[PDB]
Each structure stands twice: as structure tokens, then as C-alpha cells.
Amino acid sequence: LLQLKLELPFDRVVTIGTVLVPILLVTLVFTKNFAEEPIYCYTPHNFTRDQALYARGYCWTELRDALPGVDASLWPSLFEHKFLPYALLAFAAIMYVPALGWEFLASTRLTSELNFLLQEIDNCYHRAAEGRAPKIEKQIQSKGTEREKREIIENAEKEKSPEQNLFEKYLERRGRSNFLAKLYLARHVLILLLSAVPISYLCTYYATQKQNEFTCALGASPDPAVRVSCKLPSVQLQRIIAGVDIVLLCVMNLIILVNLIHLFIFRKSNFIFDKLHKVGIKTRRQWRRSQFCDINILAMFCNENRDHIKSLNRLDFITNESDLNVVRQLLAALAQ
Amino acid sequence: LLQLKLELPFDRVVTIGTVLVPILLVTLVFTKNFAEEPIYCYTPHNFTRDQALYARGYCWTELRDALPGVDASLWPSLFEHKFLPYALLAFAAIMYVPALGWEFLASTRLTSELNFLLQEIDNCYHRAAEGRAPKIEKQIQSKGTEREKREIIENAEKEKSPEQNLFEKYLERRGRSNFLAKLYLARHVLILLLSAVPISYLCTYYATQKQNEFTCALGASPDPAVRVSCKLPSVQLQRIIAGVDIVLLCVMNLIILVNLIHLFIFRKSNFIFDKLHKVGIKTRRQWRRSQFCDINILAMFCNENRDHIKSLNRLDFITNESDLNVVRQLLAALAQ
Amino acid sequence: LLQLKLELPFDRVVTIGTVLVPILLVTLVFTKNFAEEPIYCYTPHNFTRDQALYARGYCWTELRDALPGVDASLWPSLFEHKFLPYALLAFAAIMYVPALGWEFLASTRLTSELNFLLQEIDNCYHRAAEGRAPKIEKQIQSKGTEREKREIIENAEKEKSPEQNLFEKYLERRGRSNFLAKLYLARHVLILLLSAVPISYLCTYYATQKQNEFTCALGASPDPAVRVSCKLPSVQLQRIIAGVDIVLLCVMNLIILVNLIHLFIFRKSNFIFDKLHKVGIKTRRQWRRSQFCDINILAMFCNENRDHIKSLNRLDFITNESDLNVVRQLLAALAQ
Amino acid sequence: LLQLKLELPFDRVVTIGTVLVPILLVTLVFTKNFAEEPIYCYTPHNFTRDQALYARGYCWTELRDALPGVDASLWPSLFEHKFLPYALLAFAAIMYVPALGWEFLASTRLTSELNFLLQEIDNCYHRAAEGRAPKIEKQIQSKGTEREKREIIENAEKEKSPEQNLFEKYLERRGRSNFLAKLYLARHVLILLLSAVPISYLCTYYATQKQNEFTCALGASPDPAVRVSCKLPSVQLQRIIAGVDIVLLCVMNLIILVNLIHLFIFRKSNFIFDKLHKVGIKTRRQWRRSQFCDINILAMFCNENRDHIKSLNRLDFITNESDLNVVRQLLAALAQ
Amino acid sequence: LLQLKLELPFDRVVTIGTVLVPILLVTLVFTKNFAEEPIYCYTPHNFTRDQALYARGYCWTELRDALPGVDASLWPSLFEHKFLPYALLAFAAIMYVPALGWEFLASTRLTSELNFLLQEIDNCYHRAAEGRAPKIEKQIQSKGTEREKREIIENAEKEKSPEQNLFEKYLERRGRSNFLAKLYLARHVLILLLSAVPISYLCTYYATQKQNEFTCALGASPDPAVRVSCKLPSVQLQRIIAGVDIVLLCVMNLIILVNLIHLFIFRKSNFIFDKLHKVGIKTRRQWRRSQFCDINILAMFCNENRDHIKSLNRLDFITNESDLNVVRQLLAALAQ
Amino acid sequence: LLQLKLELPFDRVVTIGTVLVPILLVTLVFTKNFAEEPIYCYTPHNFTRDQALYARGYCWTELRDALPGVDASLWPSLFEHKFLPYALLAFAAIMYVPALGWEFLASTRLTSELNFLLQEIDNCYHRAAEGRAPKIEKQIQSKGTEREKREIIENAEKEKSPEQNLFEKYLERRGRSNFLAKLYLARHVLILLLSAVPISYLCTYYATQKQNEFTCALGASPDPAVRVSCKLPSVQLQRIIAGVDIVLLCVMNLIILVNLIHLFIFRKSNFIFDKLHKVGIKTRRQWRRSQFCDINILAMFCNENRDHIKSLNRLDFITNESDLNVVRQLLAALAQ
């Protein structure tokens, strides 16, 4: 069985909104184009049924307008309409280097450091019935105010208990090694820069390629040049999925930006040492100086895994329901 | 094994009736249109078999009527008939934001708070054979009316028993935090508003797009303009699934409305604290002031899970069969 | 269950970057060519619909230009355009001899020598609670500086302990048998040489095969020779995937080169005896003379397997957090 | 679970190099031929579109040149070009009698005699901690040179120990019954002779069938004979996979030859009694007279299975690291 | 798990050689015929493109030559060429009654009588360490030639031991009930007779149906009879798989014959009571009178299962290695 | 695991012989007809290529001969040839009511009464080592002819033993309730009557529908009636699978008849109380009066399950080998 997942809901949403519907919007064009004649041309009268097939298969691989008067070098081309069944397929696979920079680069160290937290660090507040319940509040009832609780509670974590080498040493080591925040940031700030020529390419295409009717010109008749006006069927649908992707990809560059700015400059609630700060383990103000620690990133992964761990669920029901007396009934409930 | 499901029958019915038969009613149109010629046109006599293909493939990508006398700008268009193979496919995928606002936003906290109720809170009335059976009614038989039962029964839950920190504290905490009701309501009131332009779009289409016969006009003959009257095959079937969806989607904006109004203004039977109110745990009148608590929502999820939990099945057989003496034989049955 | 994998991320990246998208870029050409007419020719007027099929199916299996004036031996050929649907398929299968030189040649000895390390050598620093904890620092606390720790710590590994025949003998045996480094190097230096005629073939093709219009010539009319100018559709797309592969394969010959040079001449951090050099087992300077030992290669495989081994994860949390006192609390934590 | 495999890497390489790429090189021809017109013929002018179909489907089932002047009996045929889509398919299935001479003839006796070695003969040198460790070197330490070790070590295997009826009796029985070597040799020397008419058939085809243009002749017009020159499309590709197979099958007749000659005349290291000859069980020179024993074949199968047997892996780490003192620390390590 | 198989290698070879490649040689004809025009006819000049389709689809369902001069009753037919795509399919399913006469008639009794031998009769020579080892040779060592071993060994099986009701009673019962030999013989002697009209049918077809060119005649022109010479494409390939099957089926009637004759008249080594005749259980000469017992058939099934039974594998290693002293070390090896 | 099967081999043979090859003989006709032109007609000369398509698609949906002279009401029809692609498909599904009268009507009671026999009634003659072995023959050896064995053996089953309420009460209850024989007979006598109009339909079709050439007549020319003689391709193959089914279904009405008559009037060996009649449980002559009991039907189901029940296999080896002293060695073998 497995309970630890390395993907946030934000990452899944980004993946399904910038890599997936790309692909699902491309097969429509492929199935529309392959189910129709590539081009329609107005062949002259005295053209046999096989002599007019050359005129229809020759102006499709050429795609060159023939403006009267001008030379043969200033003829505008139309290769873009033919070329981007695939240009939409080369942009849905480029958006994988950021996605593959996690499953192949940091898919072992992070889960190695997290499975330890899963299996080892679980004795807090689920084994406290015999660990600390008959210790702190057992002597408080049998005495005799409000200026003595701190004195007794101080000699719980500060004392070099056997269950202390696994706590406050991780905080001291990972409280300055900002390595994970130097890679998860590169996971999102890179996808914000890769989504640039995606947008910059099919933005001038939407504004400079509109026409779908050109006068193709053949030559070298077998014994005079003949000109036929042709027509391109699938131009009206190509630039309907060529500017829906514009807003679909330009709106994913805003939610990522706001997420990244609010995580690194506004939000200061880890839940990895804030939820467990009132219940006995108080952290000295050595973290407020910088929010770039890896513990902030580990906090999200810990938050995403709260269900399959039964001890943490017991803690959630037994800790946060009285957040602000409470210890009066705890001693009478666990006095076994 | 799994026994807790997070989907109500109402949600499943809504999903299969507003997202599914949408899709199953679209493939019919796709398979009907792709199995026939897109358009039929009445070409003139002196037209070769390849010169008349341009006239049949050019008036299908144009779709513009040619009324006599008027200019070239006041010609009505017919792109709607061509366009909504897909407009019916863009409305069956829009109906997922309300559906994906539950599996990705509140698919962890709710089941985290419910699996605790599944595993932890089960000692009530299945362990009562040794928990309360030799306590309350054991002394009632050996005495000596109707003005003393309450006095004895009061010192069962009011007393700070060891099995009391898990009860009446959840009621006190979740009795004012109306968070779940602020999201489940947003899951249904949003699908009632998303189903608006679905209906407002293909309602004017049913009333303004009727004709299927237009006189297309070509031009620029290779050496006079020629006009051909054409015909659209699949117009009589498109607007048969374009107004069956009207009633199919306008009838799901009424059952959701009546469900939401009757849950929030009429129904006041939780079954999460009403069924268990006569059997010993009596709740003070602190809930009647508001029906917006999360416990009301948890009541539906608890109701949907009554079978795979054998203890609750024992309770159902052993509690509700004598709802209104009864305790006379209970002491004689469990006196082991 | 299995936890040891014999493939590095570098090998997987190389395989998916030089063997895979090769294949994925070939099916596009096959599906493009098979969905169009192979060639278009300008047949004369007095040609029946079956007499012009010979002219279209005869200049496609010939593919020979007919320059006027010259003889029948100096006619340039065009077989390259027809021939390399498949020449791109014979280069995606040649890149398997290096890939199959590992799964069939050294896929048993390496994992045989590694499963021993997995199952056998695990008692270090996870069984040390009863193995060395009450031995070294137990007597240090109960005495009486900085010139005596080495004297006590010397008689731990130097002494012929029962758990010593499995250590420092592997180092002595594999410290001079440079066999694995004589094969893993041949695994990569061979793929750097196999990727030569791949590049040298479709490099002159990109520079000497440009034209796609030739004047084919028939003969032996059934009672004069007739010449028809033909046209090749799929030439403009063939040399778009014939020079994207150039850079796609010429860029994989640089990362492999830098990896191989920096492994064998710049990196001197094994992590197989460097991480475990401060924590008690100190290695004499018998390795610094050569970096060609098999232990360097085994170090990478050990690094790739750090998660599923729980003892090594415990070591990682309990060893490297205080790398540079520390032993003061270790005795008080494991004094059971 | 299964750990014993009956196929050597050499056999797998031979199978995938002489039976498989045969097959993958045939489907290409089938998909190329079936995707094109079988033949192209130059029909005369006054031929209707259905009268010229007989001329195109009649010269394809005839395939007979018509040289002028000669009679109707000296006309060369061209049936080979039509015939060997399938002649390449009848040679990829003939190469199975040697392959099916092992899975049906000796796929039970060999693995029956090998599972005994797997399960029963495993007590050597893994149970020696209590079997021979306190026996041989336990008395060597407690005495008092180099002329007494043999005397003590002699009375270990020579003595009729309880674990002796399973050793040196197999050597005596299988040391003269050369049955397996009379069948494995027939498994390879037969595939060297079956790969003869494969090569001898499509070697004269590569040298005598070159032309692909013949003048077919019809007759019996319905009221004079008419001759039409035809053309065969797929002749230039058929003899490209008709001489790549020549070298592909003529190079597999050399590696098999060198393997067979070096196994039977040069290599004399079994590893089935050579590796285990220094560690206590010394074999008398009764094997050097002939290398045709079945133990030589069993040696390869034992070598291919060294990983899933953990006892043999322990032996490999604990035996060969000191091959050439060593026993000085073995007594101190296993003195439990 | 299952270890007993009811199919001999001979039966599998027969099934794959007379039922399988039949089928694999039929799909080739079906895919060849369905990928070509059924017939080619030389229609006259003044025939429209739809009037000549009747002449091509009418002489294919008629298949009747028209010899000049003779009447309309002496016209040879050609229905055999059309009829035996399927006549080759009705002979590959007839060869199943002998194959289905075993899985439905004797697929329960045989394996019922064999699973008993598998599970019950296994105590011989694997439990002999405590069953007979301290009994026969234990007293031979402690005495005091060659005229006394038989006297002691006689009172081992002749005596009415507890493990005797399961031995020599099966021999007495099944030593005269020749029922299985009356059915397995019918399983092979029937397939030798069913494969007769298979051969007798397509033997006259190979000798009397050669021509593939007939002059079909139409009639009743809508206002004179017109004759057209037609041609059959697939006649030269039909009789290439119509005489390869001749030898393929006539060679399977010889190996079966030699197997059956040598089993019933030459071979007299059961291995079911011959291998176990020297090791203590000696059978009286009551079997040499007839080799038609069912024990001979059970011997083959026992031989095919010698691997998954580890006790019999131990016996095979420990019994046949000294077949012709030997008992001298057996007592010293099993004296526990 | 499951060992009890409710289908006899006779039922499986019937199902595969009257329901299966029906279906397998229908797809051949469907694939033959759909791969050819439905009809061929001899259109006149002055008919355009689209005016002759009406004549070919109009005489196929009419199928009415036009005899000269007679009126328009006495024209014979030919709808049968078109109609029985499907009439052969409506007869392969009718043969399921007898097949579905067992899996839905008596697929619970029978296996309910048989699983009891499987699990409960197994103590006979496998537990007899301690149940009856030291009881009957233990006192016979220690005494002192042939006129006393019956006296001792009588007080074994006649006595009201604890293992007697499960025996001879089933015989008394099911010895007169002939319910199962009233349904299994209806399962076969119904399939003998359902296979009637199957045969009676395609028997007159084989004798009255022979011709496949009719002169169709059109009319109402757009400004005289025109008659065209047409031809039906697939008539010669339809009545080849229309009279092979005749004998294939008329031969299944004989084996069922002989089976039913011999079961109910000739065979009088149940094996459910005949095999177990000599070994101690003797049945009084209360069954010979009628063979219509359900125990006779249960006997076949018991016979089909003799393998997976190991106790019954032990009984088969230990009971029937001495059917006709025998008890002399049984006491000495089981005297534990």
C-alpha cells in the first residue's frame, strides 16, 4: 500500500490545463482535415480527368500566390496553413522539460526524506497517553494559579529526552539549506518562460494569415501557362483553435504567477510547525528571517497526506477542537 | 476494502443526466453527418465532372446565400449549421468545474473527518453490553415509579467519563464553523448558473435557423458568374437534438432548486443527532438556531454508509424496532 | 517486491532521447506519405484514362531525370527520396547493440554483487544501538580532553571483530579489479561511435538532394518517345525531419562526452566510502591512485537505491544532520 | 516463484537473430506490395476501360516474356518475383525444429536433475559454521608448520560422512554418461545445416533475376494478337531484403561455429568443479581425459543461476575474495 | 498448483502437425483470393461499362466451359476451384473427434486414478529413513556372505505390513482389466482412418483439375449469343497448398504407425515396475504374458511427471546412480 | 475453489452440436454475401451509368419473376433467398429455452442438495479407521465359520447410531418425490420438440426453391416497359448450408432419444447406492418398483465429481480392487 503522493493538486491542474487539452484540441483538426479534399480548384474546360489531377495536386504542394505584374520572387507563400497541424503538436511536447525535471531529478531524495517522517516521527501525541500524559498534568491536579505552568512544561522538550535526537535537529539542519526551494521554484518559473514562443508564434499567425483563396499558376504545357483560382477548405477552423489556445495559455501564466508571489511574499503559515506550536513544541524565532527553507515545501506534502495516517487523524480530532480547562478532562480520560 | 463513498445518489443522477446523455446524443450526429455527402448542388449542363466538384466544395466552405438585387455585404450566412457538431461538444465539457470542485478541493478533509467517525466512534451501543448495560438498568430492577429514571440516567453522559472527550466537543466545535455548507452549496448553485448559456445559445438557434436551401454564387470563370441552388442534408436532424437538450437541461434546473430549497428551509431531521437523541445522548437546543452547520452535510454521508458497518446495523435492528418496558428484557438478555 | 534497479537516470534519458523520438518522428512520415498520391504527372491530351496510369506508375519506380542532349548513362537519379522512409527506421534499431550489451552481458553479476550488499551489509549504524553504542562512548562519559578519542576509537574496526570479514576485504579485492569500468565505459563510448554514420548519411542528403521536379521519359509506343514533367509531393517534409534529427543526435554526443570526462577526470566523491568515512570506517589512501575501480560504478547504483531501504534512510537522518558534542546526547538517547 | 532458466543468452541471441528479424523483415514487403498496383501495362489506344483490365490482370497471372522469333516453349518465366513474399515466410518457420528439439525432448530431465541441485545440494559452505568451522581450524590454533594441514584436511570428504552419499557419486555416475552433450550439440549442429538451402536458394535469385520489364502477349480477339510492354513495381525492394538476409544468416554460421569449437577443444574451465576445487572438495584427475561429460553442460546452467540463490551469493562474497592466513580470522568470526 | 498433465508430447506434436498448420495454411488462400478480382474476361468492344459487369459476374457463378459442337449437357464444370477455400476448412475440424474423445470420455477416471498415486503412494524410499533403513541393513552389519541377504529381504514386502494394502493389490486388479488400452488405441487408430478422405479427396484434384482458362457463353440479348474467354487468377497457388498437405498428412500416418507398433509389439520396459524392481519390490512374472494392461499407459503419464514431485526426484538421484557395497554407506549416512 | 459442476458431458455435447456450429455456419454466409454484388442484370445498350443503377437496385428489392402472358398477380416470388441470412439466425437462438430452463429454474435447489452431500456425507469409509475398523472385524479374529458374519454386521447400520439420522432418511424422503425427474426430462423432451420447425422449414426450401435466374420488369419510363434478365450470385452456396443442418439436427434427435429411452427403461445401475451396497449399507428392495426417483439423477452428478474429493478417491482405490479374506489384512493394516 502507498499513502504518500509527490504531486500537488496545483501541479495536476497545471498539467491537465496546459498539456492535455492542447492534445485533445489537435486531434479534432487532424480528423477534420483528413476527412475532406485538401484543396478545390477551378480547372478549365478542355482538361481531361487526369490532366486536372496534376493541377489539383501541384498547387497544394506549391502554395504560392501569383500576383499579376510582379516577378516570380515577390510571390507571397501560404505554407503556414499546411504547416501547423504539427506546429500545434510540437508545443504540446515541449511542455514536458519542467514536468520531467521532477520525476527524474528530485523524485528520490524528497520521498526518502518524507517516508522517514511517515514511519519514524509518529510517536508525538498518539503515544502521549504513556509518554507525557502521566507526566505534565498528573502533578498539576495534586498540588496546593497561572504563573507556574510554564516552569513545569519547560522541562519536557528542552530536556535531553531519549525522543529528542529526532527533533529540533532537523529544524537546525534544514533551517538554512534552501535547496528544495531552489528547484521547485525552477519547476514553475521555467514553465512560465517555456510558454512564450507558444504564444508569440500563433499570435502573428492570427493577425497576418487570413486569406484562403489564391490564383495558382502552372506552366510548361506539352506540345502556354494556365492559371487556376483555388480554394482552401480548412482555414476557417484552424484559426478557431489558434487563439483559443492563446487565452488558454495566457491565463495559466497568471495563476502560476499569483501562486508563486503569494507563497514567497505573503503567506507565512507553514502548518508544519504552526499547527504543532501550541501543543507543546514551541519553535524559537529562527525561521521568521527567511521563508525560503525546504520545510515550507515539505509542509505542502505533509498537508496533502493527512488521511491514510490514522495517528495524525486522531491528532486532528483531539488537538484543534479546543484551539484558542481542556487539560482537566484529559487526565481523567487517559488515567488507565 | 473500502466502505465510505463521497458521492450522493443525487450527485450521480445529476452527473449522468446532464453530462452523459449530452455526450451520447452527440456521437449520433457525428456518425450521421460523416456517413453522407455534405451538400448537394444542381450544377449546370456544360460542367465537366471535375469542374462541378469545385462548385460543390466551394459552396460548403462559403455558406452564404445570394439574394438578388442586394449588395455583397447584406448576404445572410449559414455557418451555424456547420459549426455545431462541436458547439454541442463544448457544452458537455464545461459541466465539469462544479464536478471537479469536489474531487480536487474537498476530497481529503471530508473523508479525513469521516474515517475518524468510522473507526473511532463505534463503541456506542455495540460495546454497551459491558459499557452501560450493568450500570443504568441493573440497579433499577433491584429497588423498592416514573419520577426517578431521569435522575439516574443524567449521570451517564454529563459525567466526565473516559469516553467523553470524543463527544459533545465535536458538536461544540462544528456547531458554528459553517465551512462545508459554504462549499457544497457552491457545488450546486454554480452548476445552476453554468447551465445558462448552454440553454440561451441553442434557443435562438431553434427559432432563427430554419432554412436549408440557398442559392450559392461562384465567379471568375477562366476564359460570367454562375449561380447554383444547393441543399443541406443534415438540418432536419440537427434541430431534433437541439431542443431535446433544451428540456433535458431545463428540467435539471428544477430538481436541484427544489432539493436545495427543501434542505435549507424545510427539512430539519439530520438523523445524525435525531436518531441518537432518544437512546441516551440528548442534545441541547443549540442547533435549532441555524441549519447551516457541517453536521447536516455529514449526516447525508453517514446515511449513505449504513451497510458495511456491522455495528451500526446491529444498532438499527436493536434500537428503532421499539421507538415510541423495552429495558425489562434487555437486562435479562445481556446479563452475562 | 523489488527495490534495486540497474538503470541510471542518465541511461533512461539517453534511451528516450536517441532511440524513442527517432521512432515517434518516423510514423509521421509514414502516415503522411501513405495518405496521398505518390507522384503527380502532366500527361498529354490524347491519353486515355488507363494509358496515363502507366505514365504515373512507371516514372515512380524509375525516378530518373532526362536532361536534354546527354546520353542515357549520365541521367541523375532520385532514389534517395523514395528510399528513406526506411533509412530512418534502420538507424533507430542500430542503437540497440550498446543497449543490449548490458541486459545480456552484465545483468547478472552486478545485481548478484549488489543484492549481497542489500541484504547482508545492513548491520552498520542501525544495529549499533547494541553493537557499538555501549562500547565507545559509554566509557568516555565515566572518566576523570582531545588527545584520547582516537586511541579508543582505533580498536573498533582494526580489531578482528566477528563483523569484520565482510569489510575491508571487499575493498582489498575490488580495489584493483577494474572490470566493470572496462564495460560500462564500453557501453557509452560505443554509442558515441555508432552515432556517426547516422549523422554522416543524412547530412549530405540535406545538402545534395533538393529538387523535386523531373522530366520523366517513356518510350516504345505501340503502333515516338513522349516526355512528361512530374512532381513529388513529399519532399518538403522529408527534409524537415532530416536535420532535426541532425541536432537531436549531435547534441546527445556532447552530454555523454561531458559526463564521461567529468566522471573519470574531475569527480572524486564516491559517496560509497566518502559518506561513511567520518562515522567510523576510515579508508587508507589506497584508492586515490586510480579512479577506475568498480566501487565507483557501484556507488551510483547505491545512490539510486536509498529509499526502499529503511535502515539507510534512518542513517541518512541520523548521520548527516550533524556533519562537520553530538555524541553527548546519543548515549543518553540509546541507554536502554 | 521460479529462479532456474533453461535458456542460455547464446540461445536467446541466436533465436532473436535468425528467427525474429526474418519475420520483421517480411511484413515490410507484404505491406509495401499490398499498398500498390501489382503491375503497370501500356495498353493501346482503342481499348475500352474494361477491355484493358483483362490485359492488366492476365499478364500478372501469366508472367511470361515473349521474345520475338522464338517458339512458345523457350519463353523465360518470372514466377520467382511473385512467389517469394512467401518463400521468405517458409524459411522463418523451418528454423524451429532445432528450437523445438529442446522444449519437447529434454525440457523435463535436465530441470529435474537441476532442481535437485538447487534444493538439496546447498549445505556446502553456508551451513559450514556448524558443519566444518569448529572441526578443521578449531584444533589448528590450539597446538604446539606447513606439512600437517593436508593430513587433517584429508579426513573431511574422504571419510564416509553422513553428507557424502550426495557427493562424488554424481561425479562417478555422470563422469562417463555423455548423453546431454549428445543432444545439445545436435541442437546447434542441426541449425548450422538447416541454414543451408535458406542461403543457397536466395543466392541464385540475387544473381539470375534482375529484369523487371517484359513484353506480354495476349491473343484470341473476339470478332489478331496484341502485345503490351508491362512493368513490375516491387522488384527493386524485394532484392534489398534478399541479400541482407544473406549476410544476416551467413554471419550466424560463424559465431555458432567458434562457440562450438572453443567449447569442445579449447575451454577447460567448468566453474562447476573448478571454483569448488580449492575450498576443500578436490577432484581426482578422472575428468581431464574427456570434456564431453554432461557436467560441462550443467556448468553453464549453474552459472546462469547465481543470483536468486542467496547461499551461493554468500559463498561468492566469502570464497573468491581471498583466492590465491585467511583462516586466521574465520575461526574468530564464527566462534559462536 | 497443478503438476499432473494428461497430454503426452506425442499427442501435442500430432495436434500441432495435423490440425494447426492446416488452419495456418488456409488463411493465406483466403487473404490472397479476397485481395484480387475473382475473374478476368475479354469483353467485346461495343459493351458498356455496366453491360460488361454482367459478363464478368455471370461467368463466375456459372463456371462452365463451352466446347464447340457438343450439346449443353457435356460441358465440363469448374466448381472445384471455387469450392475449396472451404473444403480445406472442413478437413481441419473433422480432426477433432479423436481429439475430443479424450477430454470428454476419459478425462476424469484417469486423473482420478493418478492423483491417488501422486498423493498417497509417495512413502516409498523417501520415508525409508525410518521405515526400512533401521530394519534391513541395520542387522547385516552386526553379525558374525552372499547366501543370506535374500532370506532377510524376503520378509519386507511379503509380510502383511500396514503399508501393504496399497501395493500388489493394484497390480492384481489392473493386471487383467485392459480397458485404458482399449481406448487410447482407439484415440490413435481412429485418427489414422479419419485422415483418409482428407488425402483421397485432394489427390484426384491435383491430377484432374489443371486448366484455368474457359470460354464462357452468355445468351438472350435484349433487342445473338456472345462468347467471352475468361481467366482464373488463383489456380496456380491453390494447388501449391493442395499437395503440400498431401505429404504433410501422409507423413503423420507413418510416425503414428511406428509408435503404435513398437509400443505394442517391441517395447517391454514400463519404468513403472522396471525401475522399482531392483530396489526391493520384485514383481512375479504375471505381466510378461500380455502388454495390453493399463499400467503400461499409466507408465507414460508417470514418466511425464518426474519434476514437481520432489520425493521422486530425490529417489532418482539416490537410486539410479549405483544401478548394476552401496548399502555400506547408506546405513552410516542415515543413522540418526 | 469449486469442484461440483452441474453440466453433464451429454449436455455440453448437445449444446456444442445444436447451438454452436449453427452460429459458426452462419457467419460464413454473411461474409460471403457481403463481399460481392447482390445481383447482376443485363441492362440494354442505351442506358446511362446512373439509369442502369435503378434497374439493378430495383429488381433486388422486388424479387418478382415476370412470366409472359399471365397477369400481375400470378408472378412467383423469390423472397426466401433474400430472407434467410436471418432465418438461420432465428433458429440458433430458439434453442435456448431448454438451455435456460436449468440455469434459472433448478440451478439453486440441486446444488444446494449436492453441497450438503459434498461437505456433510464424507465420514463413510474414510473415518472408518476409528469408526468401524475396531468394531466389526476386531472381534472376529479373536474367537473360537460362515453363518455368523451377518449377525454381527447387522448391528452396525440398523442400530440407531449417532451417524444414522443422515442416512436412510434421505432415501425414505426422496424415494417417492419424483420432482427432479419431472424437470430434467422436460429439459430434453422439449429440445426434441423445438427442433421441429427448424427442420420442417428448410426442408421445403431445399425442394421448392432451385432457380436463380428471373426476368425482372420495370415500367413508367420518363418521357414503354423494359424487361431485363437478372442473376443471383449466392444461391448455390445458401443451399449447401441448408441441408447440412438438416442432417446435423436430425442426427441430434436420435442420440437424445436413445439416451432417454435407455436411462428410463433399460439401465438399472445407479452407482449412488449400487457401488455402496456391498460395503455395508444394504438397501431394501423399495427402489426397484420405480426408476423415476431424483436419486437416479443425483447419481450422474455424483459420478461427474469423483476427482477433487480425495476421500472418495481413497474409497475407490480401497473398495473396488477386491470386489467379488479381504478383511484379514485390513485389521492388521489399521491396528493403530
UniProtKB/Swiss-Prot annotation, chains A, B, C, D, E, F:
Side Extracellular, residues: 31-83, 207-243
Subcellular location as annotated: Cell membrane; Golgi apparatus membrane; Endoplasmic reticulum membrane
Record-annotated membrane-spanning stretches: 8-30, 84-106, 184-206, 244-266
Post-translational modifications reported in the UniProt record: S-palmitoylated in neural stem and progenitor cells.
Cytoplasmic side: 107-183
Residues the record marks as carrying a glycan: N46
Similarity field: Belongs to the pannexin family.
Name of the molecule in the record: Pannexin-2
Gene source species: Homo sapiens
Phylogenetic lineage: Eukaryota, Metazoa, Chordata, Craniata, Vertebrata
Gene behind the chain: PANX2
Span within the parent record: 41 to 388 of 677
